[PDB]
Enzyme design. Structure first.
Site, PDB file in Angstrom:
ATOM      1  N   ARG A   1       1.119  -0.971   0.259  1.00  0.00           N
ATOM      2  CA  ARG A   1      -0.055  -0.062  -0.195  1.00  0.00           C
ATOM      3  C   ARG A   1       1.358   0.888  -0.255  1.00  0.00           C
ATOM      4  NH1 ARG A   1      -1.480   1.554   4.874  1.00  0.00           N
ATOM      5  NH2 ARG A   1      -1.711  -0.224   5.331  1.00  0.00           N
TER       6      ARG A   1
ATOM      7  N   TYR B   1     -13.436  18.600 -17.328  1.00  0.00           N
ATOM      8  CA  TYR B   1     -13.715  17.041 -17.105  1.00  0.00           C
ATOM      9  C   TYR B   1     -15.201  17.101 -15.883  1.00  0.00           C
ATOM     10  CZ  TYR B   1     -13.830  12.271 -16.568  1.00  0.00           C
ATOM     11  OH  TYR B   1     -14.784  11.179 -16.180  1.00  0.00           O
TER      12      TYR B   1
ATOM     13  N   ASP C   1      -3.823  18.985 -15.322  1.00  0.00           N
ATOM     14  CA  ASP C   1      -4.291  17.940 -15.893  1.00  0.00           C
ATOM     15  C   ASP C   1      -3.750  17.702 -17.563  1.00  0.00           C
ATOM     16  OD1 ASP C   1      -6.274  15.447 -16.732  1.00  0.00           O
ATOM     17  OD2 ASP C   1      -7.665  16.053 -15.550  1.00  0.00           O
TER      18      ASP C   1
ATOM     19  N   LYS D   1      -6.575   6.213 -20.780  1.00  0.00           N
ATOM     20  CA  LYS D   1      -6.623   6.748 -21.980  1.00  0.00           C
ATOM     21  C   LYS D   1      -4.970   6.534 -22.382  1.00  0.00           C
ATOM     22  CE  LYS D   1     -10.429   8.272 -19.849  1.00  0.00           C
ATOM     23  NZ  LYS D   1     -10.612   9.776 -19.290  1.00  0.00           N
TER      24      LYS D   1
END
Lengths: 388, 386, 386, 387
Positions: free
Chosen positions: D48, D101, D173, D198
Site C-alpha cells: 500500500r 472534465y 491535468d 487513456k
C-alpha cells in the site's frame, strides 16, 4: 525429517526473492535474460529453456514427490508427450493399462500407428496380464492409479518390482490423488507425472502438466526434450499453479471429508446399484488403497437405477454439481461417462469396459457437506419419480 | 438457502453467459460499447462499475448478510470511503483507543483539517462509551478483536447504545473475516475489510471492501467510490475472489494450528502472558465464544528477557517469516515495538500495554508439528540469553 | 476487406456478447459446462479449444490470409505440431542449410529416431533445390530471411517447384511477421511464427502459431495440437493479442531506425560487411523489395579487429542489451560466435560464413538519434583497440 | 547525454532486474516484504505504501514529465483526489476551469458543498475571469488543456506566471495530450496529473492515474497522503500501464497522421458546420497549441448538420468507430456528448457550454487512415439522406 508435505507446499518460494525480500515470489514473464557482459551467460537466458517462476513450481513438485527435479509443461497431455519422446524410440514397446485416460490412449494409438513405438495393453490388476506384457521386454510401463471412472487400484510395489526385474522403466500418472495422497517414487517408480489442471492448481483456471524424475540424469533428459520439443508452460500459469498448490493440503482435508459423507449416503441407497470408491470396504482394492495411499480421495462413481431417464431427472435440477468434464476443482462437478468422457466409444466398447448408461462420476469439491448431501438426496428423489 | 462456505466456493461458477465457462472470465476492459445510439449497457466505465469487481462485491455482501459491497484499491481506501460517504464538518466520529495505526493516522490527519471532530474511547469500558455517545456522534467505529492484544468489544452492546443516540456503526471485521464474525447480524450499518489479509489469503493483493446492510447506504457508497476514484483493479478482484474460495478450508487449518500453539505458549516457563481469545483466562473470552464462530489464528505473547531474548527467539526461525501484514497461508511473526508501533514513544507504547517482549503471530496453515518445533527452538534460544 | 493494420488493431473490439466490453474478457477457465444433459457448448475444455486463444488464432489467420490458426505454447511447438501433422516414417523433409538452430536440433533428434528422413538444401541455389525435390520430399521448410546473414529465399520459385513434385511447403515467417510478408499469397500450405518475437513485441510471452491455407489441414493441426498437448495459455494469448494491436505502429519505427542504422554502418571504416536486405548491394535486395512489404529491422555486420574490437564495441553500449531473442520494442545485440552459434565448432562457423567479428542487431523503437550516438561510440571504442 | 523521452519510455525498467538479469521487469504482486533480520526494514515493507513495480511506472512518468517523482493511483479521479487532500484545507480556495472534465467537477462540487475548501470557477482563457479569480488569493489553480469536448487551449505559461504572482500552486491535468505531446512542468507548474486509463496505457484494459510533482518535498507529501488515504494502484495495473507506455510514441505518430487526414475531410465538408481541432489555423488556440504542444493530438469534435436524426443515421452503420466513452486507445471511438458524456446536464446548461445535439467527438485510433475515411464518408452520406 526435513519438514512435512503440507509445510513444503505452503512455504514453496516464501523468502525466495533476493531483489526485494518479497514474501510471494515475483512473476518473471520475461522471454529473455541479459548476458552479464561479453561471453557470460547468467543462470537463465531464454524462457522456453529455463524460467525461475516455472522452476519454483518444478522444485516444489519434485520436493512433494521425492524426486531429483520437475519439468512443467503447457498441458498434462504434454507431460505424457514429453515422457514418450525422452524414453521411447522405434522398436521399443510401451505397456498401457486397458482403462487408461482416453487422451492418453488417443496419443498412444496415433504415435504407434506411425511406428514411433509398439503398444501392449494389459490389466495391471491381473498378474498373468502383467506377466505376459513383461515377457515381451517392454521399455516403459505406464500405471494410472486409481483408474477413471471405476477407481481400480493398481498395486505399485507389485508392478514396479516386476517391471524392474525385466529392465523396464515405470511412469505413474498420479493426477487423481496428487502428491499429497500418493508418492509413486517411494515405491521405486522412475517417473511420476500429473495434469496440474486438476487438484494441484485446484481452481479450474490453468491447464498444465508436470513430470518428476527420481534420478537426476533422467531429469536432465526431460529438460532437454521439453526445450527441444517446445512443451514448456507459461510462467503466468506456473504462478497461478504454485498459488493453488499452497492450499492443496487444506483443500484435500475438506474434499475427503465430503467424499466420505457422500459415499455413506450413496452406498446401499435404494436408487444406487453400485458405488466405485476406494474408501468403501467392499470396493476391490480397498485394502491396497489403505496401504499405498494417504487417503481415499474425492473422486467416485455410482450406477443410478432406472434409465437414461433417471439420469436426466437426477442431473436436471442439481444446484451444487456443475455438469462438466475435468475434476480436482474446489467446485463440485458431475459427468455422465456414456455421453461425455466415453461418448466417442461404441455402446459395445462401453459394455466391455464396464461403463453403464446409469454411471455418474462425481468430482467432490469443498462446499459444505450438508449442502452437497441435500442436493444429492433431491437428485435421487427426482430419479426415483421416473421408474415404471 | 446454502451455507457461507458453499456461497464462497461457488461465487464464480456457471455465471458466464458467453461460453458457459466454469471460472468467470476476467473483464479488464476500461470501457463498454453502447448498444446503439442512446442505449447504455449495464456497464459503461470500469471506474464506476465492472462485472469482475461486482462478483467479489456480491460474494462479500452475501457472506456478511448485506445489501451490496463496494471493492476499493486498499483497506485504508475502504475506511476513507466510509468517512467521505457518512461524515461532514460538524459531525463527530467515535474511534476505539487501540484502533489499527493506519486508521488512527487517517482519522488524525482529516480531524486536524476539520473534516469532522474525533472522540477516542475505550469501547470495552461502559463509562468511556457512555461519555462518547453523550456527545451525539454521527458514526461509531468498532474494531474487534484489536491488534495486537486481542481486546474484544461487545458488538450487540455498542451497536444498541450507538443506535439509541442516532449514530451509525461501522465495524472493521478484517481480523476474523466474514467466516468467523458477522457484525451485520447484531444490527451494524456497515462492515469493512482489508481483503489484503484473510479474504485473499495469498499475500499478493492489496484491497478493501465495504458492505452496507441497507440498499440506500450501499448506493451512497457506490456513488462516493466512483466520485473519489477509490475503486479497485478487476485483476485484483479476480485474484481476491480466487482466494475467497478457499477461506473456509484455510481457517480450519489456521485455527487447529492456533489452538496447538496457544497450548504450548500459555504457562510456558519463558512466556509471561498470552493474548488469545481462545484462552478461558483472556478478558473477552466469553464474549468471543458468543459473537465469533471461532477464536481465529492471531495471537500475541510476552517473552521473558529482553529485546535480547526477542533477538535470540527470531534469529533462526525456519517457518515464521519476520514481516508485517497477516492472514496469509504462510506463518508470520512481527515485534510491535520495532515494527507496527516503532513510530511511537517508549511511554506511549507502555501506555498502550505494548512491551519490548511482545511478539505477534499470524499463524498460517503449515503442519502444526513443524510450527511447534520452530517455536520450541525459539524459546530455548531466548532462555539462554537470561 | 479492411487493411492488415485495421484488422490487427480491431482484432479484440466489439467481440464480447456478455457486457459489450471493448477489450475481450480473459477466459482462463480450464472447463465449460454442458448446456444441459447431452448438449456440449462450442467450448468444453481449454486444452482442445479456448475463446481467448481462438481470437488470436483468428487474428493471425486473417493477417496471413489463411483458413485458420493454431496457437502453441512456443515457436518450437509450432514446428513440432507441423512435423507431427504432416510427416511419418518413410517421408522426407527438406530443411534450409542455415535454418534456426532450435529447428535443426529438433529435426536432427527426431530424424536420428526414424520419425522421417532429412535432406539439407540451399534454397537460394536452383540445383540444390532441384536435387532435393527429385527425391519426392513430403514437406519443404523455407525460412526467409535467414538468421544471421539475412539470405532471401524466393518464395514463388521454391513453392511452384515444390508443388510440381507434390511436396507441401511450410514457411517460418518469424523474422518479418505477417505485416511484412504473406507466404500464403505465394501458394504456401502453411506459415508459422514464434509469437515471442515481433507479434507479441514486448519480450514477456513465449508462444507460436501455425496458419494453414486450407480448412482441412487447419482441422488436422487442431486435432494434433489437442492430442499432443501443444496448445498455449489463454493469459499468454491475451498478452500476445495486446501486443499485435501495435505491430503496424511498432514496425514503422523499427524500419525507420533500421534504414538509419544501415546507412551509418554500410559506409563505415570499422565495418567490413553489412547483412541487410534494404541495401542495394545485399544479395537478394531486389527479390526482398518484391516479395516483402518492407526490409525489416534485423541486420548483422562484421566489425574490423576481431574479438577484442567486439569486446570494446559491446562494453559500454547504453541502448542495446546483450541478449538473445529479437523483435522486442527494446534494441538488442547478440554475438553469434559466443551466443546463438556457440555450440558449433570453429570450422562449422567458418563453413556457415559466421565470423568472430559478426554482430547481430535487433533494432527497437527507441529514438534513431540515440541508437546512432550509441553505435558511433561503440565504433570509436572498437577502433581504439587497433 | 540524456536520452530522448521516446528512448526513456521504451527502455523503462529494461535490464533493471538484479535477481536474474530479466530483460522485462518481474511483476511484484507481493503485499508484504521480509525484514532483513530483527530491526532491519528493507527498502519495501508493504505494497500500500511502496511497491517496486508501481515505483517503476512512477519513475518513468516523472522522467517523461521532468519532475522529481510520481505517485500511481487506482484511477485518474484518485490522482485529482490525492492532490485536493495533499494541498487544500478548509478556508483555502481552489480555482477550476469552467469546462473542466465532468468527473473533476462532480468531485469539486461534492467536497466544496461539505466545506473542505471554497471553490471558484473561471474561464482561464479570458484574462479578466482569471484576474478576478486570482485576486481572491487561491491556494491552488487547476488547468485542463486542451478541454473536452471543444478543445479550448489555455495558455500554460500565462496562467502559471499569474498564479505564482499571487502565491498559488498550479496543477495541470495533462491527460488529453500525454507527456509525449505536452510538458506542463517545463513552464513552471508545481504538479501534473494523468488518467493513465487513456493514452499512457493505450489499450483500454487498465483504469489508473498518476501525479508528478516538480519539487521533491511536494512529491514526499503526495507519497504520504496516497499511503494514508489508501489511493495507491495495483502492481498488476502498473505492469500493464508500463507495457502500454513503451509504445506511446509509436502509437501517437499514427494517431496524429490519422487525425490530420480526418480533420481535412471534415473541415468545410458540406455536412459539417464546425470542427473543433487545434491543428486547424481557424481554431481559437491554434497558435498557442503549436507553441506549448509538440503536436495537435488525435481528439476532435465536429458539428453535424441535421441534429439528432442526422447523428443517429451517422452512427448507425459505423464499422471502425465504436460508440463508447473513454478515449486514447488504439481503437477509434465516437461519443455523442448530449446523450453520453454531458447527458446529466440540462438542455439549457448544454446550450450554455456550447454543446449542441449535432456535436460528435472522435477519439482517433491507429487503424489505416483510408479505412477510417471510408467509414466517416459513408456516415456523412447517411446523415445527408436525413434532411
Amino acid at each position: 525429517t526435513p519438514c512435512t508435505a503440507a509445510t513444503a507446499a505452503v512455504r514453496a518460494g516464501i523468502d525466495r526473492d533476493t531483489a526485494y525480500g518479497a514474501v510471494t515470489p515475483p512473476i518473471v514473464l520475461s522471454s529473455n535474460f541479459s548476458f552479464d557482459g561479453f561471453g557470460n551467460k547468467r543462470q537463465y537466458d531464454y524462457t522456453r529453456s529455463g524460467n525461475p517462476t516455472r522452476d519454483l513450481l518444478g522444485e516444489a513438485l519434485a520436493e512433494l514427490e521425492g524426486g531429483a527435479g520437475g519439468v512443467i509443461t503447457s498441458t498434462g497431455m504434454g507431460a505424457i508427450n514429453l515422457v514418450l519422446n525422452a524414453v521411447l524410440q522405434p522398436g521399443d514397446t510401451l505397456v498401457v493399462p486397458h482403462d487408461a485416460y482416453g487422451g492418453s490412449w488417443r496419443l498412444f494409438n496415433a504415435l504407434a500407428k506411425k511406428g514411433h513405438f509398439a503398444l501392449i495393453t494389459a490389466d495391471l490388476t491381473v498378474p498373468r496380464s502383467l506377466a505376459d506384457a513383461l515377457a515381451q521386454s517392454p521399455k516403459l510401463v505406464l500405471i494410472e492409479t486409481p483408474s477413471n471412472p471405476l477407481l481400480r487400484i493398481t498395486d505399485l510395489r507389485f508392478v514396479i518390482e516386476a517391471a524392474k526385474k525385466v529392465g523396464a522403466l515405470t511412469v505413474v500418472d498420479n493426477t487423481f490423488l496428487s502428491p499429497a495422497l500418493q508418492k509413486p517414487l517411494d515405491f521405486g517408480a522412475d517417473l511420476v507425472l500429473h495434469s496440474t489442471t486438476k487438484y494441484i492448481n485446484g481452481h479450474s483456471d490453468v491447464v498444465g502438466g508436470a513430470v518428476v524424475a527420481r534420478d537426476a540424469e533422467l531429469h536432465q533428459q526431460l529438460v532437454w526434450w521439453a526445450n527441444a520439443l517446445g512443451l514448456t508452460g507459461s510462467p503466468f500459469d506456473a504462478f497461478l499453479t504454485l498459488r493453488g498448490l499452497r492450499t492443496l493440503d487444506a483443500r484435500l482435508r475438506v474434499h475427503q471429508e465430503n467424499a466420505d459423507a457422500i459415499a455413506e449416503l450413496l452406498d446401499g441407497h435404494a436408487m444406487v446399484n453400485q458405488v466405485y470408491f476406494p474408501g468403501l470396504a467392499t470396493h476391490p482394492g480397498h485394502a491396497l488403497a489403505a496401504r499405498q495411499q494417504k487417503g481415499f480421495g474425492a473422486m467416485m462413481s455410482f450406477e443410478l437405477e432406472g434409465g437414461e431417464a433417471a439420469v436426466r431427472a437426477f442431473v436436471d435440477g442439481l444446484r451444487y454439481f456443475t455438469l462438466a468434464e475435468s475434476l480436482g476443482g474446489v467446485e463440485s462437478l458431475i459427468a455422465h461417462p456414456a455421453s461425455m468422457t466415453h461418448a466417442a466409444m461404441t455402446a459395445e466398447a462401453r459394455a466391455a469396459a464396464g461403463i453403464s448408461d446409469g454411471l455418474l462420476r462425481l468430482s467432490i469439491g469443498i462446499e459444505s457437506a450438508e449442502d452437497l448431501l441435500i442436493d444429492l438426496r433431491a437428485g435421487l428423489s427426482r430419479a426415483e419419480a421416473t421408474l415404471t
